Amino acid sequence: DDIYKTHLENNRFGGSGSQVDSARMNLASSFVNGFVNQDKLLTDDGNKWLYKNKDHGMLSAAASLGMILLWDVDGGLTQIDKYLYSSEDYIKSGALLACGIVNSGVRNECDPALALLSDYVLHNSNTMRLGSIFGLGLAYNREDVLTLLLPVMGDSKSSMEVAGVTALACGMIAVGSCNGDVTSTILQTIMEKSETELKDTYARWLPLGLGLNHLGKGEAIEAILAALEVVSEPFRSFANTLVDVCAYAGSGNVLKVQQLLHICSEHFDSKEKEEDKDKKEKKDKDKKEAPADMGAHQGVAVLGIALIAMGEEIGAEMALRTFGHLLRYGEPTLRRAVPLALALISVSHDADPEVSYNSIFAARLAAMLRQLAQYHAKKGTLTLCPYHSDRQLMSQVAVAGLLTVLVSFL
Amino acid sequence: ETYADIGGLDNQIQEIKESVELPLTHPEYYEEMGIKPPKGVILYGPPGTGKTLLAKAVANQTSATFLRVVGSELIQKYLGDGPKLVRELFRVAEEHAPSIVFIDEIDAIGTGEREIQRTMLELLNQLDGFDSRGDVKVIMATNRIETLDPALIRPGRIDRKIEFPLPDEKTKKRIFQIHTSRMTLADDVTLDDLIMAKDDLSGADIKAICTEAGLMALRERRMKVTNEDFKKSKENVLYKKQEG
Amino acid sequence: DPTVTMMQVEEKPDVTYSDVGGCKEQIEKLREVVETPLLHPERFVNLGIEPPKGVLLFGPPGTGKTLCARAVANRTDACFIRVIGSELVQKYVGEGARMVRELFEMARTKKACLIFFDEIDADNEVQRTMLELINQLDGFDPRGNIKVLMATNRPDTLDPALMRPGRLDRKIEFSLPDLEGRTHIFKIHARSMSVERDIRFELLARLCPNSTGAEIRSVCTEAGMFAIRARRKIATEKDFLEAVNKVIKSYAKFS
């Protein structure tokens, strides 16, 4: 049905695949390539395209062949088998990630990767644990993988993405539970979370999976228990306000609106970002009240709060009206954050804002992300989790290996 | 009031449709030719009044930025600043490229007076594209095609010109059919004497008597159109333009 | 910098010499004055007194805006400066002297650049521009050997009856339409959008007798407008033949 009724042109692969350079626009070309699944020319345009890329570019480009092949379950083995058990660790780890992305019900690639699992310091099965635990988490209260995930959370590797895809893996596995659970999973990751107050990025992405497990509304007592035990120094208090973010999927609770306005003037410059960012999730249905006066404030990230609060809707004239002002900014965080929502909110008026980006720019992140918007132009938790976890992109390029595997993009 | 609502001139409206909807829209048959005559069509009409001409220019209002510079009224009611207002409209039209510049009721030479010639010659110089290219289209409309001087013809029309036929109660029949497509009224209302009541009129004062026919008919708290209240309200329009 | 300064510089080489047809004698008489004096400066100084100044091009429009284009294309890659006649007669008079002196100053910056005045056919506000225009072109202050040529439609004869016997000479006509001359203008219109070469150019050139350059320019212009109107891929006369005979006959009625 997709191949027959549609006929895409090759000038996007040739052009958008031709003006790429600096090893980052080439990452944008691995994004355009990976999110293409008709034509499979740029997919098989010679070799060395993955070798010229970087390590995290070898992860994203190794997973690109998996992202282009979410079909044809019979041929997936004979297509991904080329990069399996190769000489490079990132090629085989991104190849197991590819095997986790191509399908979600085969579950036959678990044993060759999840079987050994014995590294304990650095060995390859940690990145293969990223691709296999993350890809299997996308494929999936099953204990046949959580019992193996207990030494994963108990290991606490210096690599952030280990507990990243582990907390997000068990979180996406635990969404939709009957009134949630306060078992030794979130209790274990909370005790081991507060065990070492180092590398606060753990204290940022662990509340992601925590809030994912907090699903199960119906006045559950998980918010009160977390409000009793979790209240501590403002890191686990930021975890607490993250539980407040994921705990308000939506009801008649205007106390959260007067409390939102009361706590909106807090000195902490992150609970405003997340707690005020919850506006796009709480009132996501009644879009008549979603536009507010957040743009008139003076906060350093409130324009980002409204900019992300725009979302991925049909993109009416009011939304594009907000993108007309949010598009012109001086900091690379807002100029890098505006094309994602600008192109996600509009899927002869689509490429014109991109021409406006050409008028503004003509750095590396703005060009790679503006090409990401060049191809992005054309209540389920699976469509609410990836960007809420993506709200921490203002860090090292290590996250860019997880930036291209967002499953919410249809 | 869309391009497909009116009848009797579907070819004349698909000519301006297919003519001014050519740039920036439907690019598979626009970039292969490589002509781009950035001059636009020129409309006119003996009835004029902006109703028929607006009904022809409404084709651009489907999907485009709304921008219409109707007549040179703001040029003559303001101080003699000259063409700088047209330069501001042309630079905001440059910042609003996906638009179509429409001009209705051209009353420059039809109605100080010596400045109209220099702002019209400079208007011709800036309209021809002295320092511009095919960014925005320009559609000129007025009450008479003969009001345009021969200066505004050769460098002011290089794209296409049209001819508007006499109303012959078919444009009036379709306009009255549109005005009766939403309201509830039987065939008891004579059409000929009301579309030709004073001397001739396509849509303007029949839209006026439709407005004061819905309001005046609403005064009686009945949605039906009485055979004496419609003409009783028509006597005001017939008497107004004839007494003074 | 005003718009006349940024637009005054000529670029994008337009119609070339390939349109040599019909009036070949006068186009040579005006080609040997724009090409030869600048390309061969030594044997014209050693040849005698001075090289030819220029000619005059009045009368019927015909193939206007194509011969000056030919003079722009056949340039020696040192582009010259041209002036349009619409800038002379404008509002707020008095700036014409500053303009005619600043373009001569730019000619001094461009090592005695050639100055051309197009469409001179566009009352003291005019008398100062023509008397000072003679006092600048016929004056030896900027230069007396760069370029003098007035290609226009109407001469607007105010004082040529006594200002013609002098530095300006060679009273000739502009051009004239012939039967076999239009095929060259069609051959340079082949440089436009790809037209199927199966259609012979003489077949299209022999069905429009006594057609000036503007009429065939309206053939290849209105044929292009009605070609892009037809929403097609290639241009073939079997589709816009009604546009051709309509544009030559409906315009041949009055012109």
UniProtKB/Swiss-Prot annotation, chain A:
Record field: compositional bias (Basic and acidic residues): 271-291
Sites bearing N6-acetyllysine, chain numbering: K199
Residue spans crossing the bilayer: none
Chain positions covered by the region annotation Disordered: 271-293
PC-type repeats, residues: 60-93, 94-130, 131-162, 165-199, 208-237, 366-378
Signal sequence bounds: none
Tissue: Found in skeletal muscle, liver, heart, brain, kidney, pancreas, lung and placenta.
Phosphoserine sites (modified residues): S16, S18
Complex and partners: Component of the 19S proteasome regulatory particle complex. The 26S proteasome consists of a 20S core particle (CP) and two 19S regulatory subunits (RP). The regulatory particle is made of a lid composed of 9 subunits, a base containing 6 ATPases and few additional components including PSMD2. Interacts with RPGRIP1L. Interacts with CRY1 in a KDM8-dependent manner.
General function of this protein: Component of the 26S proteasome, a multiprotein complex involved in the ATP-dependent degradation of ubiquitinated proteins. This complex plays a key role in the maintenance of protein homeostasis by removing misfolded or damaged proteins, which could impair cellular functions, and by removing proteins whose functions are no longer required. Therefore, the proteasome participates in numerous cellular processes, including cell cycle progression, apoptosis, or DNA damage repair.
Membership in a protein family: Belongs to the proteasome subunit S2 family.
Listed name of the protein: 26S proteasome non-ATPase regulatory subunit 2
UniProt source species: Homo sapiens (Human)
UniProtKB/Swiss-Prot annotation, chain B:
Outcome (variant: I139T): In BKAH; uncertain significance; contrary to the wild type, it fails to rescue eye defects in Rpt2-null Drosophila
UniProt crosslink position (Glycyl lysine isopeptide (Lys-Gly) (interchain with G-Cter in ubiquitin)): K56
GO terms for MF: ATP binding; ATP hydrolysis activity; proteasome-activating activity; RNA binding
Subcellular localization(s) per the UniProt record: Cytoplasm; Nucleus; Membrane
Binding locations of ATP: G45, P46, P47, G48, T49, G50, K51, T52
Membrane topology recorded in Swiss-Prot or TrEMBL: Lipid-anchor
Any one GO cellular component localisation term in the record: proteasome complex
GO biological process terms on file: proteasome-mediated ubiquitin-dependent protein catabolic process
Keywords: Acetylation, ATP-binding, Cytoplasm, Deafness, Intellectual disability, Isopeptide bond, Lipoprotein, Membrane, Myristate, Nucleotide-binding, Nucleus, Phosphoprotein, Proteasome, Ubl conjugation
Keyword Nucleotide-binding found: yes
Signal peptide boundaries: none
Domain of life: Eukaryota
Chain positions found as N6-acetyllysine: K77
Family statement drawn from the similarity comment of this UniProt entry: Belongs to the AAA ATPase family.
Protein's job: Component of the 26S proteasome, a multiprotein complex involved in the ATP-dependent degradation of ubiquitinated proteins. This complex plays a key role in the maintenance of protein homeostasis by removing misfolded or damaged proteins, which could impair cellular functions, and by removing proteins whose functions are no longer required. Therefore, the proteasome participates in numerous cellular processes, including cell cycle progression, apoptosis, or DNA damage repair.
Disease linkage: Birk-Aharoni syndrome: An autosomal recessive disorder characterized by failure to thrive, severe developmental delay, intellectual disability, spastic tetraplegia with central hypotonia, chorea, hearing loss, micropenis and undescended testes, as well as mild elevation of liver enzymes.
Record-given protein name: 26S proteasome regulatory subunit 4
Organism whose genome encodes this protein: Homo sapiens (Human)
Gene designation: PSMC1
Full-protein residues shown: 182 to 433 of 440
UniProtKB/Swiss-Prot annotation, chain C:
Protein induction: Expression is not cell cycle-dependent and occurs throughout the cell cycle.
Keyword field: Acetylation, ATP-binding, Cytoplasm, Nucleotide-binding, Phosphoprotein, Proteasome, Ubl conjugation
Keyword Cytoplasm included in the entry's annotation: yes
Gene Ontology terms describing biological process: osteoblast differentiation; positive regulation of proteasomal protein catabolic process; proteasome-mediated ubiquitin-dependent protein catabolic process; ubiquitin-dependent protein catabolic process
GO molecular function, one term: proteasome-activating activity
Record localization: Cytoplasm
Positions that bind ATP: G59, P60, P61, G62, T63, G64, K65, T66
Protein modification: Monoubiquitinated by RNF181. Phosphorylated. Dephosphorylated by UBLCP1 which impairs PSMC2 ATPase activity and disrupts 26S proteasome assembly.
Modified residues (N6-acetyllysine): K253
GO cellular component: cytoplasm; cytoplasmic ribonucleoprotein granule; cytosol; extracellular region; ficolin-1-rich granule lumen; membrane; nucleoplasm; nucleus
UniProt record similarity statement: Belongs to the AAA ATPase family.
Assembly description: Component of the 19S proteasome regulatory particle complex. The 26S proteasome consists of a 20S core particle (CP) and two 19S regulatory subunits (RP). The regulatory particle is made of a lid composed of 9 subunits, a base containing 6 ATPases including PSMC2 and few additional components. Interacts with NDC80/HEC; this interaction is detected only during M phase. Interacts and SQSTM1. Interacts with PAAF1. Directly interacts with TRIM5.
Protein name according to UniProt: 26S proteasome regulatory subunit 7
Organism of provenance: Homo sapiens (Human)
Taxonomic placement: Eukaryota, Metazoa, Chordata, Craniata, Vertebrata
